[PDB]
Design an enzyme around this catalytic site. Structure first.
Site, PDB file in Angstrom:
ATOM      1  N   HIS B  41       0.747  -1.231   0.085  1.00  0.00           N
ATOM      2  CA  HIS B  41      -0.009   0.075  -0.083  1.00  0.00           C
ATOM      3  C   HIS B  41       0.833   1.299  -0.042  1.00  0.00           C
ATOM      4  CE1 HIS B  41      -0.735  -0.037   4.744  1.00  0.00           C
ATOM      5  NE2 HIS B  41       0.014   0.944   4.471  1.00  0.00           N
ATOM      6  N   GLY B 143       2.418   6.311   9.681  1.00  0.00           N
ATOM      7  CA  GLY B 143       3.898   6.147   9.471  1.00  0.00           C
ATOM      8  C   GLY B 143       4.267   4.877  10.039  1.00  0.00           C
ATOM      9  N   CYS B 145       3.046   1.664   9.624  1.00  0.00           N
ATOM     10  CA  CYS B 145       3.095   0.503   8.720  1.00  0.00           C
ATOM     11  C   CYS B 145       4.368   0.201   8.398  1.00  0.00           C
ATOM     12  CB  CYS B 145       2.041   0.912   7.549  1.00  0.00           C
ATOM     13  SG  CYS B 145       0.509   1.167   7.976  1.00  0.00           S
TER      14      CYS B 145
HETATM   15  C1  LIG Z   1       0.126   2.621   8.685  1.00  0.00           C
HETATM   16  C2  LIG Z   1       0.933   3.622   7.884  1.00  0.00           C
HETATM   17  O1  LIG Z   1       2.157   3.978   8.244  1.00  0.00           O
HETATM   18  N1  LIG Z   1       0.350   4.233   6.786  1.00  0.00           N
HETATM   19  C3  LIG Z   1      -0.912   3.699   5.963  1.00  0.00           C
HETATM   20  C4  LIG Z   1      -1.947   4.810   6.240  1.00  0.00           C
HETATM   21  C5  LIG Z   1      -1.360   6.058   5.278  1.00  0.00           C
HETATM   22  N2  LIG Z   1      -2.369   7.116   5.203  1.00  0.00           N
HETATM   23  C6  LIG Z   1      -3.244   7.246   4.566  1.00  0.00           C
HETATM   24  O2  LIG Z   1      -3.363   6.604   3.490  1.00  0.00           O
HETATM   25  C7  LIG Z   1      -4.800   7.847   4.954  1.00  0.00           C
HETATM   26  C8  LIG Z   1      -4.930   7.831   6.177  1.00  0.00           C
HETATM   27  C9  LIG Z   1      -6.225   8.516   6.472  1.00  0.00           C
HETATM   28  C10 LIG Z   1      -6.982   8.996   5.503  1.00  0.00           C
HETATM   29  C11 LIG Z   1      -7.054   8.505   4.429  1.00  0.00           C
HETATM   30  C12 LIG Z   1      -5.801   7.997   3.887  1.00  0.00           C
HETATM   31  C13 LIG Z   1      -0.093   6.568   6.037  1.00  0.00           C
HETATM   32  C14 LIG Z   1       0.986   5.424   5.907  1.00  0.00           C
END
Ligand SMILES: *CC(=O)N1CCC(NC(=O)c2ccccc2)CC1
Ligand SMILES: *CC(=O)N1CCC(NC(=O)c2ccccc2)CC1
Lengths: 304, 304
Positions: B41, B143, B145
Site C-alpha cells: 500500500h 507512518g 506501517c
Molecule cells: C500505517 C501507515 O504508516 N500508513 C498507512 C496509512 C497512510 N495514510 C493514508 O493512506 C490515509 C490516512 C487517512 C485517510 C486516508 C488515507 C499513511 C501510512
C-alpha cells in the site's frame, strides 16, 4: 490509534551489558567508556549479606578477582573503587558501542524501561515507574542484579536505575548510577518494609487523556471539581496530592482534547467513588498510573 | 520474583528498520540480506486505498521510485516484486546487521514483540498476541506501517507480523512476511469488522500459574472440574474451548507448582462466575490472556 505500555527500544543498552563474577556470585554490569558499573554486593557471600562491612570485604579483593566478560571476550580490569553502593571497575578497553549517555536521579512518579539481563545477556524489556514509596514493581530473578533502568532522549540514554534488592514482599529496590539507593533501602538482608504504595494521580489523569484521544470516553461526566475538593477524595483513596504544577504539566493534553484538567479530575473522582462497574479503559480494569504526561504525548504523537 | 508483560530485547530488529518512500507516502521496511520488505500500500494515494488494483498501480512504478534510506544513507534499488500484500525491494547492499532469522506464520493465542517505528526509526517495544479473531491490539499511528512482530529463540529472530491496517474500531490487521493477511482482512479502505474477541483460555491458566509462583494465591479454592464442565462455563464467557493439547502444554507449570491443570481450571471457573471482588492478580483487575505457557516458563526461569 491504540495505546500500549511501551518500553524504549533496548539496542543501545544491550550494547552495554557485561557479566561480572566475584568468587561464586555472577550478575550484570554496565560497560560505558572504560568503566564497568555493578552492585557492590557482588563481593558478598550469601552469609556476608546479613551484616556486610563493604569497605572491609573490599580489602580482600584485587582487580584480578573481578571477572568481566562481554559476550565471549574477557575484559582486563586495571582498577576498582566503591562509590556508595556501586563498584566502578576500570577496564583497559573503552566499550566501542558506548552511546551518548547521562546518569540522572529520577523522582517518584517518573517512568523508565528496564532491560532484564542474566549473566550479561538480555532476557526482555518492560516499562516501570519509581513508586512514591521508592520501590519499583519489576521482574527480577537470581542473576538479574546490575540490570539497569533508562530513558532515551533521541540518541542520548539517561541511566536512572541499577537493580540491587528484592524485599520479602516481592517488590524491588536499587540505586541511581552514582550508587545511591532510591528511598531508605540498604544492600543488607534485614527487615526492610516498603511504605504506602500511593497512586501517581498526575499519571492516571494523563492516561485518562490517552483514553479519550483513543476513543474510550464512557467515564467522561457532567461534573467539575477544585484541587482542594479533589485532594479530599485523593487522600481517602491513597492518591498523591494534585498540585498546580501537575495541572500545568497536563496543559498540552488539556489543549489537544479540549477537556479542562479539573473536569478530568471530576471524572477520576467519580471512578474512585463508584468503581469501573465491570467496564474497562484502554483494556484495563483499574486506573493505570505508570504513564507520565510526557509518555502520553510521546506515544500519541509518535516521537522516535 | 515479580511478573511483567515483557518484550524481547529489540536491538537485533532495530538493526533491520529502514524508511521506504513511494511518492508522498512514507512508512517502514524490513532490511534482511539484500531485500527490503514493506506493505504494498506504499504505492497507493489515499484515493487508491478505497479500491486499489495493486498489479495495475505497480506497472506505473520503477525501482528508482522506491526511496530506501537506512539512517542517513540511501540504498540503491535494483529490483522489485509483489508477493501477496508485501513488496520485496532488492537492494545492491546486504544489511551488514542481518541477524539469523526465520519467517513464521503464528496461530491465534501466540504472543510476539512489536517494534513500533516511524520513518524507519524505532519509537518503542511492546508485547502482543494474535487474537482469536486474527486482529492485534497495537499502538500504531500514521507512518507506523511496516513495523514488524517477532519472537527471538536465543540468536534467531522469527518474524511473524508486518503492520498494514487499522480497522474503524481501532484494532490492527497485518501480514506474515510472505505478505498473507492474518484472518480475512484486506489492504483496502472498506467495511471490515472483527469477529468475537474471545479470551485465550490456555494463556489465562498459564498467567494463573505465574501468579501462584510469585505469591498471589487468594483465588486458589477447594474445587476441581472436567474439560467438558469447564468448557460449558468457557462458552458462556466467550473463552476458547480448552483441549487436552492445552492441558498437556500446561504440564510443566502443573509439575512445578503441584496444582493439577483441572484444579486451576476450577479456580478460573470461580473467577469467571464470581468476579475479582475488587482484588487484583499480578497487579491486574482482569484475567490476562497475552502470556503463553512458553512466555511464563521463560520469564519464571530467566531464559536469555
Ligand atoms: C500505517 C501507515 O504508516 N500508513 C498507512 C496509512 C497512510 N495514510 C493514508 O493512506 C490515509 C490516512 C487517512 C485517510 C486516508 C488515507 C499513511 C501510512
Ligand atoms: C539480584 C542478583 O542477581 N543477585 C543478588 C542475590 C544473589 N543471591 C544471594 O546472595 C542469596 C539468595 C538467596 C538466599 C541467600 C543469598 C544472587 C545475585
Amino acid at each position: 490509534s491504540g495505546f500500549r505500555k511501551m518500553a524504549f527500544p533496548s539496542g543501545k543498552v544491550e550494547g552495554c551489558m557485561v557479566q561480572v563474577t566475584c568468587g561464586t556470585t555472577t550478575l550484570n554490569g554496565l560497560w560505558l567508556d572504560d568503566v564497568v558499573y555493578c552492585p557492590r554486593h557482588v563481593i558478598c557471600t550469601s552469609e556476608d549479606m546479613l551484616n556486610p562491612n563493604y569497605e572491609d570485604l573490599l580489602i580482600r579483593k584485587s582487580n584480578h578477582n573481578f571477572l568481566v566478560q562481554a559476550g565471549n571476550v574477557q575484559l582486563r580490569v586495571i582498577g576498582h573503587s566503591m562509590q556508595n553502593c556501586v563498584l566502578k571497575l576500570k577496564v583497559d578497553t573503552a566499550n566501542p558501542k558506548t552511546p551518548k549517555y547521562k546518569f540522572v536521579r529520577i523522582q517518584p512518579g517518573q517512568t523508565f524501561s528496564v532491560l532484564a539481563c542474566y549473566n550479561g545477556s538480555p532476557s526482555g524489556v518492560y516499562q516501570c515507574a519509581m513508586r512514591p514509596n521508592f520501590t519499583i514493581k519489576g521482574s527480577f530473578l537470581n542473576g538479574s542484579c546490575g540490570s539497569v533502568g533508562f530513558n532515551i532522549d533521541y540518541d542520548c540514554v539517561s541511566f536512572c536505575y541499577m537493580h540491587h534488592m528484592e524485599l520479602p514482599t516481592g517488590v524491588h529496590a536499587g540505586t541511581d548510577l552514582e550508587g545511591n539507593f532510591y528511598g531508605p533501602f540498604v544492600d543488607r538482608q534485614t527487615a526492610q518494609a516498603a511504605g504506602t504504595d500511593t497512586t501517581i494521580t498526575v499519571n492516571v489523569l494523563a492516561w485518562l487523556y490517552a483514553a479519550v484521544i483513543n476513543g474510550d470516553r464512557w467515564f467522561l461526566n457532567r461534573f467539575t471539581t477544585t484541587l482542594n475538593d479533589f485532594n479530599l477524595v485523593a487522600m481517602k483513596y491513597n492518591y498523591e496530592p494534585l498540585t498546580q504544577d501537575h495541572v500545568d504539566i497536563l496543559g498540552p493534553l488539556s489543549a489537544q482534547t479540549g477537556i479542562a484538567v479539573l473536569d478530568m479530575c471530576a471524572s477520576l473522582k467519580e471512578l474512585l467513588q463508584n468503581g469501573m462497574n465491570g467496564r474497562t479503559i484502554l483494556g484495563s480494569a483499574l486506573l493505570e498510573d505508570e504513564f507520565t504526561p510526557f509518555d502520553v504525548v510521546r506515544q500519541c504523537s509518535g516521537v522516535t
